[PDB]
Design a binder for this molecule. Structure first.
Ligand SMILES: CCCCCCCC/C=C\CCCCCCCC(=O)O[C@@H](COC(=O)CCCCCCCCCCCCCCC)COP(=O)([O-])OCC[N+](C)(C)C
Ligand SMILES: CCCCCCCC/C=C\CCCCCCCC(=O)O[C@@H](COC(=O)CCCCCCCCCCCCCCC)COP(=O)([O-])OCC[N+](C)(C)C
Ligand SMILES: CCCCCCCC/C=C\CCCCCCCC(=O)O[C@@H](COC(=O)CCCCCCCCCCCCCCC)COP(=O)([O-])OCC[N+](C)(C)C
Ligand SMILES: CCCCCCCC/C=C\CCCCCCCC(=O)O[C@@H](COC(=O)CCCCCCCCCCCCCCC)COP(=O)([O-])OCC[N+](C)(C)C
Ligand SMILES: *[C@@H]1O[C@H](CO)[C@@H](O[C@@H]2O[C@H](CO)[C@@H](O[C@@H]3O[C@H](CO[C@H]4O[C@H](CO)[C@@H](O)[C@H](O)[C@@H]4O)[C@@H](O)[C@H](O)[C@@H]3O)[C@H](O)[C@H]2NC(C)=O)[C@H](O)[C@H]1NC(C)=O
Lengths: 83, 181, 73, 174
């Protein structure tokens, strides 16, 4: 039971690893997500007013992209923890 | 010594933030530890009813301390989770916990009219108003959170002070007499 | 259960499309999650009924024979 | 091993304080075995009280770590000395590295889009101030793990070497 608690602590450390805290190594990711899962189982007056809109739209798009990358690496760590 | 160790853990729940979700785990399981240790004390000490011993008074003080910490922690958790819409902030709480607590201030924040195009315009406007309303609700939620945090900073010091003071009041009255003897 | 094509405007349009497809995929995944959630809720209901029935049956059948025997003699 | 648990798991108290509860159960176990005299303390009681103090200290340090982790980024500002010690200096000695290297209709649309952009910028700034506190909490949790290991090893070795080297006398009468 003591060893299982230690295992649970390690698995929870693996599960809650975050992009801003840890680096997902490619050998680790390839080992724990491919191998072991298989083994186990004018035109400027307009632009004077549209430039803030275009810049803001680009910012929102980049923010969504960064959040999606963050989330995807989070599910990658979760899948490693499950394996 | 175990009673002292359980007593020192009683006030530490007031250093635990509410957003951890483990404040009542700590308090209730310290109570469980005290309750289990009651078996040890009953097994060790005399069972007499002529008078209350000093150990009996210390055990009761520790238990009442844990109960008070549990009650006040529940009050703190209730204050932390007050909804901005249902529960309006009274002005007296704001004055006494956001204004008159200026002691330790490491704190802060004390022609294209197609229907589709018009609908897109209105949807963008609606999105912005939605996020604005969410921010406005979060601000008052955070005000209540600040009040609960201030209450926890006060009560941590209060509980550690009482933990020292009650133990000294229980034991010094006889220890000084023995030193004089 | 007018023609103003420019490298920064095209990025905004493509990113708006990306945002829409992103919340489309998120909605699909979320719905697939609520399906399993509905399944787990259904097993919770069935096993609540089953466990209360077994609790009643065990409180009765263990004590039934000796209570009726004492009622009779 | 409570110090290796993440703060985001929400299980540090539920582990350390339940270890304390188990230790109380073993105190009950020994309550009917040890001598009741007061001329000295048994070494096994010394070891049990040492272990209880260790667990009690694990709870205290875990509470400090969770206070650092869940610290509100807006109402609690980082002192510059915390930033200097726990972000730049001690991570290099503890083996921790942060991956971060450090028309009337259209006008309403423009204002709305700028409002979303500004709100998202504020969200990123608040996030950054959040991860600073969280990284300080992690560093303070790796330091506390190492000092807990050191204290545990030193105390356990001292007590066990005291116990093991207590031999019977080879002479019935010194
Ligand atoms: C008890 C002594 C302390 C009473 C504190 C009363 C004020 C706090 C309070 O009501 O908060 C909670 C009880 O907070 C509690 O702690 C209620 C405990 C009651 C049962 C105690 C059993 C032991 C309940 O809060 P509320 O009723 O949802 O708040 C409505 C507004 N009001 C606080 C003005 C009523
Ligand atoms: C015992 C547990 C409780 C201690 C309480 C200390 C004071 C306190 O309230 O918190 C302080 C913690 O001080 C800091 O701001 C730094 C926190 C430590 C960081 C590094 C830890 C290193 C540990 C070893 C390696 C901050 O308090 P505050 O944010 O200034 O708010 C005022 C609080 N007051 C009114 C109670 C003063
Ligand atoms: C690390 C923490 C846990 C490890 C040790 C556990 C504590 C128990 C222990 O070893 O007793 C320690 C402290 O015990 C005392 O409390 C001091 C004795 C005086 C009691 C009150 C004095 C007034 C040491 O025991 P002692 O009490 O110093 O007994 C030696 C004196 N005598 C042998 C002459 C009696
Ligand atoms: C039973 C114990 C089994 C230990 C070995 C198996 C788990 C190893 C492990 O993950 O170590 C853990 C606990 O590391 C320790 O706590 C090491 C010391 C444990 C025994 C202490 C005896 C005194 C982590 O140790 P670490 O040094 O933080 O390892 C780097 C982890 N990192 C990449 C997340 C930073
Ligand atoms: C187990 O318990 C025993 C007691 O119940 C312990 O026995 C004691 O051991 C000590 C040390 O060996 C003895 O003390 C010694 O006594 C001799 C003899 O003293 C006599 O002769 C001298 C001669 O000059 C005289 O001056 C004295 O007054 C006596 O008449 C001394 O020479 C030594 O210096 C020393 O004092 C005790 O006498 C002895 N007690 C008994 C009742 O036998 C035993 O050691 C314990 N075993 C252990 C701890 O392993």
């Amino acid at each position: 039971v003591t060893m299982v608690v230690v295992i649970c602590v390690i698995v929870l450390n693996i599960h809650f690893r975050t992009p801003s805290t840890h680096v997902l190594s490619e050998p680790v990711k390839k080992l724990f997500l491919e191998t072991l899962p298989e083994i186990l189982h004018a035109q400027q007056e307009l632009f004077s007013e549209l430039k803030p809109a275009v810049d803001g739209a680009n910012f929102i798009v980049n923010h969504m992209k960064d959040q999606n990358n963050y989330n995807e690496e989070k599910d990658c760590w979760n899948r490693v923890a499950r394996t | 010594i175990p009673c002292l160790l359980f007593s020192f853990l009683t006030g530490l729940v007031f250093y635990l933030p509410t957003d951890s979700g483990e404040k009542m785990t700590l308090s209730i399981s310290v109570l469980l530890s005290l309750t289990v240790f009651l078996l040890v004390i009953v097994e060790l000490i005399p069972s007499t009813s002529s008078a209350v011993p000093l150990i009996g008074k210390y055990m009761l003080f520790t238990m009442v301390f844990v109960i008070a910490s549990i009650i006040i922690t529940v009050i703190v958790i209730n204050t932390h989770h007050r909804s901005p819409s249902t529960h309006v902030m009274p002005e007296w709480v704001r004055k006494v916990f956001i204004d008159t607590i200026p002691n330790i201030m490491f704190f802060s924040t004390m022609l294209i009219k197609h229907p589709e195009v018009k609908s897109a315009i209105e949807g963008i406007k609606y999105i912005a108003e939605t996020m604005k309303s969410d921010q406005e609700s979060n601000n008052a939620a955070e005000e209540w959170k600040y009040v609960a945090m201030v209450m926890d900073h006060i009560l941590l010091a209060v509980f550690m002070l009482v933990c020292i003071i009650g133990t000294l009041a229980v034991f010094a009255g006889r220890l000084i007499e023995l030193n004089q003897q | 259960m007018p023609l103003i094509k420019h490298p920064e405007v095209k990025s905004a349009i493509e990113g708006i499309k990306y945002i829409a497809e992103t919340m489309k995929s998120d909605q699909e995944s979320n719905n697939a999650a609520e399906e399993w959630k509905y399944v787990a809720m259904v097993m919770d209901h069935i096993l609540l009924a089953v466990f209360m029935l077994v609790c009643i049956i065990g409180t009765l059948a263990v004590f039934a024979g000796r209570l009726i025997e004492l009622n009779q003699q | 091993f409570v110090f290796y648990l993440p703060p985001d798991a929400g299980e540090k108290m539920g582990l350390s304080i339940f270890a304390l509860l188990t230790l109380t159960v073993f105190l009950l176990l020994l309550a009917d075995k040890v001598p009741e005299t007061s001329l000295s303390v048994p070494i096994i009681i010394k070891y049990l009280m040492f272990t209880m103090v260790l667990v009690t200290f694990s709870v205290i340090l875990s509470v400090v770590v969770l206070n650092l982790h869940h610290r509100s980024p807006h109402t609690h500002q980082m002192p510059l000395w915390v930033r200097q010690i726990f972000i730049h200096k001690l991570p290099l000695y503890l083996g921790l590295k942060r991956p971060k290297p450090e028309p009337p209709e259209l006008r309403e649309v423009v204002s709305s889009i700028s409002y979303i952009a500004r709100q998202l910028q504020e969200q990123e700034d608040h996030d950054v101030l959040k991860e600073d506190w969280q990284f300080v909490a992690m560093v303070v949790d790796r330091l506390f793990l190492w000092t807990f290991i050191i204290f545990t090893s030193v105390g356990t070795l001292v007590i066990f070497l005291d116990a093991t080297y207590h031999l019977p006398p080879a002479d019935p009468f010194p």
